[PDB]
Symmetry: D2
Subunit: 118 residues, 4 copies
């Protein structure tokens, strides 16, 4: 089976993708996708509950992300959910759900892109 739990999110980047490198020399980009849904007999529609999702994406992919996308860029993200743990100074278990990004791209819904393949 390999029931990796998959998700697709659409939204905007809270800020420029943070790019870092591990002990092992490997690349990583961190960024948070903020999704805003919408809901309808209210006259017009309305906005909705904003959802911030932290995103991790590794290696060559990550450099591409870093040098293509800015604060506020609207993107579309396919990936897997991961549960990270860590502790407070006082030893409290904290957990966050994060996204392991498999594919990501800018969204031509409201814009145009120039594709540089390889």
């Amino acid at each position: 089976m390999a029931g990796d739990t998959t998700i697709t999110i659409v939204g905007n980047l809270t800020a420029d993708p943070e790019l870092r490198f591990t002990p092992s020399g490997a690349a990583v980009a961190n960024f948070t996708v903020a999704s805003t849904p919408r809901i309808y007999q209210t006259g017009e529609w309305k906005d909705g509950e904003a959802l911030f999702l932290r995103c991790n994406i590794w290696r060559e992919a990550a450099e591409n992300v870093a040098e293509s996308l800015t604060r506020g860029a609207r993107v579309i993200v396919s990936g897997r959910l991961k549960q990270r743990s860590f502790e407070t100074r006082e030893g409290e278990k904290r957990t966050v759900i994060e996204v392991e990004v498999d594919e990501i791209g800018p969204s031509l819904r409201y814009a145009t892109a120039k594709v540089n393949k390889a």
Copy 2:
């Protein structure tokens, strides 16, 4: 558009679905779905990083859940992700991602069910 961020999860219930009722008299069931993925040239496959996901489901749906599913039942869940906030005694912002369940069912992958419609 109405970009509500959707997800499908498969896994087991950590324990019997907790059923409660609001001020307003409304029903709610709480339960946590634990997903276990798998990953392959290791000889055989292997298990993987377990993912606990807390789940909320409201109203008539909720009673149905409550009186159909037990600790450990393997289920399949379609729904939307929500970001809840709350604070520690000391005023720390804590956030959890939870699931608003739209459809759920037992999984005939390993079992049989008796359907009682209405």
Copy 3:
């Protein structure tokens, strides 16, 4: 990073599942799910165009399915999409898109069910 195109579908079975057996022993169920969305000032939300999808499930699940489910039953399905290239009486090719079902269950949205392992 593999890439079978996954899908989740919710709807009603059109008919009692069709459970066959290969000479080579193994079990096979087939069926079809009608996803009827309830997605213009007239009320709140009224049916609109159903979608029908041939599903293929195999092995022990298939038995379990056939045994449990029933024309009309409401189900949730997680599968992958597959093209299978058909061949008509007249000829041509006539390719069609179908669903390798990974998991399936009856929806407790409008129903109870008792379970059996």
Copy 4:
């Protein structure tokens, strides 16, 4: 709770997008995405059966798409599935499953792109 059956698809465009215009003013792009999975002791993982899906996108996105993308380009797509009932030269009906695209972008898995709003 609506219920258009949503899908996400990743693959390569088979051809330069086809951008038309309705007499009634409006824009329409059409194209087709080849989802090629890379999902038996021989290595690690080798191509295997592609899946091809006719996509329909509309309005301003369509312009934006046509303008930005290119035969061969790798894309991510979020859409809903629709049956549209066809009609062949010989007759019959010949129904086919397609994709109302909601969002689409080029994948930065193997590429850079500069963006323009």
